[PDB]
C-alpha cells in the first residue's frame, strides 16, 4: 500500500508532487541546461574539463619523467644500425631540449632500444600535445578547433637511413618537400615535410659532422578533447608496447627512482593508471553527444490546455533522463580520473613516482608545454595543480550535482508512470 510508503520515505512523496507539476519539471530542465553549460562550456569551473586536462597532462608528464633515460636507435626498418645518430628536437633529454637516439648494433625491440619508427610515433603525439597544452585546451563542446604544430629531427652518421626518401616521402633529400593529407576525425590534416642537408664544413656548424634535417609542419590538427586524448593514448601505448630499456641518473640528495635500470613497461602500476585515466576521460567526453542530442530547452506542460497528466503527457522524460544520467556519469568519471592519480590514496613506489617526479617541475611556473634543459626527470605538466583545480571545481558543483540528481529522479518517475 502507498500511504504506508510515503510515511517511511518522506522525500518520495515530495518527488511525486514535483513530477506532476509542470513548473517544477521545467525548473529542473532549466537546471539541466545550466549544469550542461558548466560541464561542456566552461574550463576552469568544469570538473569534466579538468579531468580531461589531467589525463592528458599525466601522459605527457610520464614521458617528461622518463624519456631522457630511454634508449633508442637503429635504422628505418626497425633494424639495427652500425653508426646512426638521430636527434629529435623539443624533447626532454638529459640537460638538453633534444633526445638523441644513438644506440647501435643492438636490435630495437623489447628491453632494447626504441626503434626510430616508434620514436617518430611517440614524438609526433608528444609535439602535438605540448603544442595544444601550450595554447590552452578548448571547452569540451568545441570540436572544430585546430592547431599548427612544427617539429624537427636530424640524422647523421654513416649509413643512417632515418631521413631518406623511403623514411620521409620526399623525392630530393636536399631542399626537397612533400605534402600529404590524411584525415584525423572527419577533419583534413595537411602535413608538409621538408628536408635540408648541412655539410660538416658548412659555417655555423657546432657538431663537427654533417647531417640531414627533417621539418614537419602539420596544419589543421584537431585540438578537441576526443582528438587530444587519442594522442595521449598513442603516446602511452607506444611506450608501453615498445617497452624499451631505460636507465636513470640518480641525482645527489634528490628524490630516488626505483628501479634504476629496467624496461619502461616495468612501471606497470603507473602505466595502468594513466591508461585508465585516458579511458575514463574518453568515456566522459562521449557523454557530450548524449547531452547535445537531448536539449532540455523546450518547455513542457499539458496539451489542449487541460491539466498535465504524468501518465500520458510525458514522452520528453526518456530524453531528460538520458541527459541527466549523462551529466551525472560525466561528473563521476571526472572524479574517478582524479582518484586514479591523486597521491592521497596512492601507496608504495607508485606514490613515490607521483609525489617525487610526475607532480614536479624542474624548469625555472613556465607556461604549459615548454621543454627546457631542466625538464627531464620531472613531469612539468601541472599535475598537482590540475588535481587541486579538479577538486575545487567539484566542490563548486555542489548545487548542480543535486539538481541533476533531482532532474534524473523526476524523469525516472515519469518514465515509470508512462507504462
Amino acid at each position: 500500500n502507498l500511504s504506508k510508503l510515503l510515511t517511511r520515505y518522506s522525500t518520495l512523496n515530495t518527488l511525486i508532487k514535483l513530477s506532476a507539476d509542470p513548473s517544477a519539471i521545467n525548473a529542473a530542465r532549466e537546471n539541466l541546461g545550466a549544469s550542461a553549460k558548466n560541464l561542456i562550456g566552461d574550463t576552469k569551473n568544469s570538473p569534466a574539463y579538468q579531468a580531461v586536462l589531467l589525463a592528458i597532462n599525466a601522459a605527457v608528464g610520464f614521458w617528461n619523467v622518463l624519456g631522457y633515460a630511454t634508449q633508442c636507435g637503429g635504422n628505418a626498418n626497425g633494424q639495427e644500425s652500425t653508426s646512426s645518430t638521430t636527434i629529435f628536437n623539443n624533447e626532454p633529454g638529459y640537460r638538453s631540449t633534444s633526445i638523441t637516439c644513438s644506440l647501435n648494433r643492438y636490435k630495437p625491440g623489447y628491453y632494447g632500444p626504441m626503434s626510430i619508427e616508434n620514436f617518430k610515433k611517440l614524438n609526433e603525439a608528444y609535439q602535438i600535445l605540448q603544442t595544444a597544452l601550450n595554447k590552452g585546451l578548448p571547452a569540451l563542446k568545441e570540436n572544430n578547433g585546430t592547431v599548427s604544430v612544427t617539429y624537427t629531427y636530424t640524422c647523421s652518421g654513416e649509413g643512417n637511413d632515418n631521413c631518406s626518401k623511403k623514411a620521409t616521402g620526399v623525392s630530393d633529400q636536399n631542399g626537397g618537400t612533400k605534402t600529404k593529407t590524411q584525415t584525423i576525425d572527419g577533419k583534413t590534416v595537411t602535413t608538409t615535410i621538408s628536408s635540408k642537408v648541412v655539410d660538416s664544413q658548412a659555417k655555423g656548424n657546432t657538431t663537427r659532422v654533417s647531417y640531414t634535417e627533417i621539418t614537419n609542419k602539420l596544419d589543421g590538427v584537431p585540438d578537441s578533447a576526443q582528438a587530444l586524448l587519442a594522442q595521449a593514448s598513442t603516446l602511452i601505448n607506444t611506450i608501453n608496447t615498445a617497452c624499451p630499456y631505460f636507465s636513470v641518473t640518480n641525482k645527489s640528495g634528490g628524490p630516488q627512482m626505483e628501479p634504476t635500470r629496467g624496461k619502461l613497461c616495468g612501471f606497470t602500476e603507473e602505466i595502468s593508471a594513466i591508461q585508465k585515466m585516458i579511458t575514463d576521460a574518453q568515456e566522459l567526453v562521449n557523454q557530450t553527444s548524449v547531452i547535445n542530442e537531448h536539449e532540455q530547452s523546450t518547455p513542457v506542460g499539458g496539451n489542449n490546455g487541460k491539466p498535465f497528466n504524468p501518465f500520458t503527457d510525458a514522452s520528453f522524460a526518456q530524453g531528460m533522463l538520458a541527459n541527466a544520467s549523462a551529466q551525472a556519469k560525466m561528473l563521476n568519471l571526472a572524479h574517478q580520473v582524479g582518484q586514479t592519480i591523486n597521491p592521497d590514496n596512492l601507496t608504495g613506489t607508485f606514490k613515490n613516482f607521483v609525489t617525487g617526479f610526475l607532480a614536479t617541475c624542474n624548469n625555472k611556473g613556465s607556461p604549459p608545454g615548454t621543454v627546457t634543459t631542466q625538464t627531464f626527470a620531472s613531469g612539468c605538466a601541472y599535475v598537482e595543480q590540475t588535481i587541486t583545480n579538479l577538486n575545487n571545481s567539484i566542490a563548486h558543483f555542489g548545487t548542480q550535482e543535486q539538481q541533476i540528481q533531482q532532474a534524473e529522479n523526476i524523469a525516472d518517475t515519469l518514465v515509470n508512470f508512462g507504462s
Epitope: H335, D344, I394, A395, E401
Partner: nanobody, 113 residues
Framework: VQLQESGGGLVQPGGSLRLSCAAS????????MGWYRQAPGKLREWVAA???????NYADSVKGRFTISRDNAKNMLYLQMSSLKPEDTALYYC????????WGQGTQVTVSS
C-alpha cells in the same frame, strides 16, 4: 562505506550547533566532502563543501553563518552553525562530492522558540 552524523538537536533562534560526521577512509581520503540538508516538504539541498586542502565554500542561504571544517587525521567533518533561524530546521547529512550513493541516517536540527 559509512557515514555517521551527530550533534543535532532542538535550539532557539540565535543558537549554535556543531554537527559532526565520522566518515570512513574510503569516502573521506583525498575527497571533497560536504554537508547537505533536507527540510520538511523539500528535496535534499546542498549546504557546504570543503576540499582536501581545507578550502571551504557555501550555499548562499548559509554563507556567513555556517563554517565547514575537516580533520584529515581522524576522517572527521564538522559544520559549525551560527545565528540559526527557523528556516535552518532540517535533517543534515554529510557525504563526499560527488556523492557516495548510500547516505547516512542524518542528524535532526530544529530551530524554534
Amino acid at each position: 562505506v559509512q557515514l555517521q552524523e551527530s550533534g543535532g538537536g532542538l535550539v532557539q533562534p540565535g543558537g549554535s550547533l556543531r554537527l559532526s560526521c565520522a566518515a570512513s577512509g574510503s569516502i573521506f581520503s583525498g575527497n571533497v566532502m560536504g554537508w547537505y540538508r533536507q527540510a520538511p516538504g523539500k528535496l535534499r539541498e546542498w549546504v557546504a563543501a570543503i576540499t582536501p586542502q581545507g578550502v571551504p565554500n557555501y550555499a548562499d542561504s548559509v554563507k556567513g553563518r555556517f563554517t565547514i571544517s575537516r580533520d584529515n587525521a581522524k576522517n572527521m567533518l564538522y559544520l559549525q552553525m551560527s545565528s540559526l533561524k527557523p528556516e535552518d530546521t532540517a535533517l543534515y547529512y554529510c557525504n563526499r562530492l560527488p556523492n557516495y550513493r548510500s547516505w547516512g541516517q542524518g542528524t535532526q536540527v530544529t530551530v524554534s522558540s
